[PDB]
From a paper:
In this paper, we report the deposition of the XFEL data for the recently published SFX structure determination of a rhodopsin-arrestin complex (Data Citation 1) as well as further details of crystallization, data collection, structure solution and validation. This rhodopsin-arrestin crystal structure is the first GPCR-arrestin complex structure that reveals the mechanism of GPCR recruitment of arrestin for desensitizing G protein signaling and initiating the arrestin-mediated signaling cascade.
In recent years, reports have been increasingly emerging about the successful structural determination by X-ray crystallography, owing to the development and the application of new techniques including protein fusion and the lipidic cubic phase (LCP) crystallization by which protein crystallogenesis occurs in a membrane-mimicking mesophase environment. Crystallographic studies of GPCRs, nevertheless, remain a significant challenge because even in LCP many GPCRs produce micrometer-sized crystals that are too small for study at synchrotron sources. SFX has a high potential for structure determination of challenging proteins such as GPCRs and other membrane proteins that often don’t form crystals of sufficient size for synchrotron data collection.
Author numbering:
A (entry chain C): -159 to -149, -104 to 326, 1012 to 1339, 1343 to 1361
B (entry chain A): -159 to 326, 1012 to 1339, 1343 to 1361
The structure:
């Protein structure tokens, strides 16, 4: 428009303030035009475009200068464009400023904004430089040294060289190391591996081609090569982007919800990598096939997406909006929500148990990484989005080649520093690459350590949990005086919640949560215990002189030993709670536990099992009635069981009694022993699943009653090869039974974390109504536990 | 002689007494002291006797005091010049008569007799007696003097004969007064008081009223009920017949005579009464001997239950009758005699009067020694070894409470059996022995009645202990006295309350672990309310008839028993099998599972084959799973309700193991008494484990280097039946046998292979053949070879079975034939299905 016209032509206050000073001159000049008797009729006759051209003349020369033009203003008023321009071209004004005048003179002839060219447009390219001097040539043919200094092309060659030397080894090593080591290949790392592949496409497809062209100073490969280079450069950047989005989603869902660790197998990881490739191709492909275009950007060396030149033939407006809104804002919102809720959950969880120092070290290291993840994301993509936005809002202004290079610097730098933060700073990949870079290197019972210095003793594995008080751990530890000299032996009780692989979760960001941990001294003691047990006395007399006792107690707010059943195809997936008694020697004071000298330590797992109590609860008898949308008649149902507490391998007779007073017919009566798997770690998440189920084919008629008793036998054998089934904690890969019903102590202070279990008989009536089938159902709770031996 | 003379005349007083003179005198006229003090008499008495007598001395001590007087008086006679030549002139008998005179009157009194002592020295007996009879001495004590005066005349002890002898009888009373008459003619009221004859009538009446019904009912009840008629009860029936002979033959006749007071029937009737009385008593005695022998052999050895048919029981009753007639008949035909005993009412054997015409000495010795010692030795040995066996057996498995109640009941009965036997026959034996040792002494009629009381009482109380206290006969007589009154499969009870379910009957026995019993039991809530249902595993050894064995003493032995509860259970079952889960889903809500396991020390299910004629004979091991309802707590297993209980038998069968043992190859050499050359024999089989119905090639190889010729070569598949219950008792038997007619020459070798086919069909109609346990009277096969686990703690009771190939060489030696033989073991079992 008029403001953009004079800004290009004519050339401390702000730019917006200068625009207002200009608008005052526009207002003042237009008044001056309408005042002069010679200028007013010409202004009224001419169109908005030629009016702005007249204002340009009135701006510089003034009303005085423009008023002197008799013949031209006559010919302009009479719609004679050529001879007006001829008279103008032969004047002092064209001689004074032939750059400015030639553009205005052509405007008077054409009557269109064709003359007003910022840069030099082309069929397959856009050079951000004026061809008024007559120096602009094709980027696909001749050198581009007129844009910027020749040494800056050597700088681009040196820069792209730096990206290849840093970029290729890091990403190639990431994949190479993964092929060697089995430890790394896990579904969560699949998305991190996709990030490595994405960055490799930026190196081979993008930077090496940009290097070759930067040396010559122009794009040698032509339009075809520019399309393919720009395609791989975009694809590499977009796959890298959406890889980080998927990684954020994964890390939020997998960490916060422990059940999802089982869920996320290889097929889900493939879907994440697939989605990454689909979203990348969704925005990378259209530039080739019409919607937008790949052209040489900046110095006309690197090819990229056209987000500056508004070409409605290829439709850049809608593409830049589509790109900006979706590919910028949505990842930002998703990633900030993901890691934001992640840190929110961890900070609240860390504050919940401040006694555990290990969680505080984790929470700190996570929050430090999340701040760096955000900084890396913003530094990468904000330059492109901000410049593209500023170019879109201010379209009339001109923009140089080096200005477009600044976003390209930070974005292509992300090809380097994203592997640093997401792969190199990752704890596992750091230790795995350390190995590769350095060429491969860098009755009563007991258990003996590996070094055979410390030897732990325990009376039993299965420790009982009574509702009021828990049965404590009791035992002794034999020590070698010669080996353990000037050292501290500690006996430790450990309760742990385990989810996922040990190497994969600990290394990524934060590790498995410990529900309760307890350290205790042994050799030498300050003296702890009041009086010793019969077990400790017997062991002291049996064993030699270097034997020392210990007594580790459980508090009242812990869960039982419970694991979850994996499928047979799930080879590398495990989640479950388990207790661990461990003893070790060390030089260091009390707080040095999390990290361990491996050789001296010895560990032996135990269980906090709950037997069924002597008092059986009240005989379960649920009852519920129903109505329907048309028929208002009642349908009374009453369920009743034999016992409140059933035992393992016991028949469960469900005496259902249904009295039908409604018009509808019932199709069938199905009973199901459904187990509620209530999983608790960070948040309360219930998970229902059926275990055993039996259904009768009998039908209840209108105004007819029925009394049937169906027996159900919930067993592990029939429920084998199923995901999510909670079992009692196994000792060492041996056969077990279905998980016991967890009992919680009445009116306790702290919340009970861990895997809680409860069973219930759920009868459901398939009622044959008016195509649609109404399924009414009711539940009644019961317990499945072991008997008292 | 002399001691018996003065004991009858002067009278033997044990305690200190004042004589006619009023001096302290003890024993047979043995003075103590002249002082009025009693302790002075005690002083000389205590010093003479040699202990604290306190006036009381034994009869034998009084005899020694008398012998001192005999010695002292004889010295006094020899001191006197008038008495010495008379003492020297007379014989031992008349010397004792003189000592009698010297005892009472003293040396002073006898010294005065001038004329008599002259005539006695001159061998003039009659006028001496006339002179002695005309003295103060005959006037003083004509009872005593008349006996001594007659002794001087005769020179025999006829005056001093205790009782009154006769042709057909012996009365234990003196005929010196002149009151004794024949027991076959006149009353005997002079012997004892008339009311004691009425007592005998009342006593014999009591024996008839108690004796006849008990023994007659025993036989009457047996004729009615089929259950009782069994070989073991045959000897108990013989006891009833024996006691009936004592009633009809003995007591009724004794009753008739006791009322009159003398034996009315004469010598002929006395012989017949005494014959039946002895016969009834002796058949009763030897019946108890046979009963003791039977009960020892039958109980301790389970195999003998089969053996004891009617013919062996008849031999026992026959032997009883033969031994009875062996001692009952001779009194009739000369050796001893039947005469009226005691009060001369009851007739019995003469064991008191020594009559060498009928030879009572040899008879009383023959009877006493044989009929007392042989039952005593046999019966005490029988019941002694029986209780010894049962007490040791009860201690072997104290876990079984049922055996402890039996062992207690047994020991209680055996003590009573001994007490009843001793109380019966000891009185007769002790009195007869005492009479034989002391023949010179007198014995009254009531003294002889005391043994007769206890022996005839045994006619009553033996039926009480042996028949009435017997468990079967007690329940059988109760009926008569009260007039006639007083794929998976399952089995339902009689009342149809409890219903047991089991997957299979044949449970397998592997050597290491036994396959356990698995199943469920359906229960009715309405019928079984406030009751306790138990499922029970029972392993049992059975021998003999079911009713008879409980009655004798103790019942069949259970090898192993284990009961288990069901409704309601302590909790539930830990983990269920596919069978229990399937049955629970098929059946309704009131179904409860059970799992009964076998230990490693039990045998297999094995029975023994009976003969076709053996209709009522059975012995064999079998397993029984039983379920029942009851009101009572756990230990009330011993008794069960017949209606609520339901039982289903099973087997602990052993299949042949997958890996066969080493190829059997036995070898043995032989020598002979004359020829010292070796005869090497070597046997070899195809397999260690043969199966049922498989050919058994016995490749015999005989290398003869001896001078003798072999007659033939016989091979035999022998079944060793090792039966163990109380003691280890092996029982060998052949099953299959084949023999070749070929002969091995001197210095010649032979290699032959004979095949043998052991089958049940060929071995039918044979006693003692062990078979695999039948389910329900169906066809089976020969018993499987039993396998025992290595190095177990407890001993394996039950019927163990094993097979071996026994080759025997009939060697034609120097008419006489030597039969050498060797064995090699093998197994006969079923294949793995």
């Amino acid at each position: 428009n008029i403001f953009e016209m004079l800004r290009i032509d004519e050339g401390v206050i702000t730019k917006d303030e200068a625009e207002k000073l200009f608008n005052q001159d526009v207002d003042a000049a237009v008044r001056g035009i309408l005042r002069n008797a010679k200028l007013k009729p010409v202004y009224d006759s001419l169109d908005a475009v030629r009016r702005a051209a007249l204002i340009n003349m009135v701006f510089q020369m003034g009303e005085t200068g423009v008023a002197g033009f008799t013949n031209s203003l006559r010919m302009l008023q009479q719609k004679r464009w050529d001879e007006a321009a001829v008279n103008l071209a032969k004047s002092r004004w064209y001689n004074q400023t032939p750059n400015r005048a030639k553009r205005v003179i052509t405007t008077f002839r054409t009557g269109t904004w064709d003359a007003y060219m910022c840069g030099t447009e082309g069929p397959n390219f856009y050079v951000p430089f004026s061809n008024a001097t007559g120096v602009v040539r094709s980027p696909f043919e001749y050198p581009q040294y007129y844009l910027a200094e020749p040494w800056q092309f050597s700088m681009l060659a040196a820069y792209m060289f730096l990206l290849i030397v840093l970029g290729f080894p890091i990403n190639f090593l990431t994949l190479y190391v993964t092929v060697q080591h089995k430890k790394l290949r896990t579904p969560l790392n699949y998305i991190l591996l996709n990030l490595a592949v994405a960055d490799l496409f930026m190196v081979l497809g993008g930077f090496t081609s940009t290097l070759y062209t930067s040396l010559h100073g122009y794009f040698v490969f032509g339009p075809t090569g520019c399309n393919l280079q720009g395609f791989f450069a975009t694809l590499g950047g977009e796959i890298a982007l959406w890889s980080l989005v998927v990684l954020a989603i994964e890390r939020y869902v997998v960490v916060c919800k422990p059940m999802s660790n089982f869920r996320f197998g290889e097929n889900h990881a493939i879907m994440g990598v697939a989605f990454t490739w689909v979203m990348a191709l969704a925005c990378a492909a259209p530039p080739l096939a019409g919607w937008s275009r790949y052209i040489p950007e900046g110095l006309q060396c690197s090819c990229g997406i056209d987000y500056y030149t508004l070409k409605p033939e290829v439709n850049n407006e809608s593409f830049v909006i589509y790109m900006f809104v979706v590919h910028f804002t949505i990842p930002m919102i998703i990633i900030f929500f993901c890691y934001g809720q992640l840190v929110f959950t961890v900070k609240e969880a860390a504050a919940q148990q401040q006694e555990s120092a290990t969680t505080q070290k984790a929470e700190k290291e996570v929050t430090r990484m999340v701040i760096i993840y955000v900084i890396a994301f913003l530094i990468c993509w904000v330059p492109y989005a901000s410049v593209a936005f500023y170019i879109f809002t201010h379209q009339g202004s001109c923009f140089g080649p080096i200005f477009m290079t600044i976003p390209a610097f930070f974005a292509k730098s992300a090809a380097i520093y994203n592997p640093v933060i997401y792969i190199m700073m990752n704890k596992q990949f750091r230790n795995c690459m350390l190995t590769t870079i350095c060429c491969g290197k860098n009755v009563i019972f007991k258990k003996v350590s590996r070094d055979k210095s410390v030897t732990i003793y325990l009376g039993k594995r299965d420790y009982v949990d009574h509702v009021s008080q828990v049965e404590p751990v009791d035992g002794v530890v034999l020590v070698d005086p010669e080996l353990v000299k000037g050292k501290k032996v500690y006996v430790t009780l450990t309760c742990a919640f385990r989810y996922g692989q040990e190497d994969i979760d600990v290394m990524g960001l934060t590790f498995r949560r410990d529900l309760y941990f307890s350290r205790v001294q042994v050799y030498p003691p300050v003296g702890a215990m009041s009086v010793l047990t019969q077990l400790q006395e017997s062991l002291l007399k049996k064993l030699g002189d270097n034997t020392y006792p210990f007594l580790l107690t459980f508090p009242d707010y812990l869960p039982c030993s419970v694991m979850l059943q994996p499928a047979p195809q799930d080879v590398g997936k495990s989640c479950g709670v388990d207790f661990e008694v461990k003893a070790f020697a060390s030089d260091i004071t009390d707080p040095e536990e999390d990290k361990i000298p491996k050789k001296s330590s010895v560990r032996l797992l135990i269980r906090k099992v709950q037997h069924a109590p002597p008092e059986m609860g009240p005989q379960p008898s649920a009852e519920a009635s129903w109505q329907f949308f048309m028929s208002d008649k009642p349908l009374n149902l009453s369920v009743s069981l034999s016992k409140e507490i059933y035992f393992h391998g016991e028949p469960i007779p469900v005496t259902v009694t249904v009295t039908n007073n409604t018009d509808k017919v019932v199709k069938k009566i199905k009973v199901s022993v459904e187990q509620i798997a209530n999983v608790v770690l960070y948040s309360s998440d219930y998970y229902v699943k059926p275990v055993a189920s039996e259904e009768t084919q009998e039908k209840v008629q209108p105004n007819s009653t029925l009394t049937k008793t169906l027996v159900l036998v919930p067993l592990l054998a029939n429920n084998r090869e199923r995901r999510g089934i909670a079992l009692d904690g196994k000792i060492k890969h041996e056969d077990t039974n279905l998980a016991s019903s967890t009992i919680i102590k009445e009116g306790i202070d702290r919340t009970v974390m861990g895997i809680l279990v409860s069973y219930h008989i759920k009868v459901k009536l398939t009622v044959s109504g008016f195509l649609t089938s109404s399924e009414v159902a009711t539940e009644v709770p019961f317990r499945l536990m072991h008997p008292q031996p």
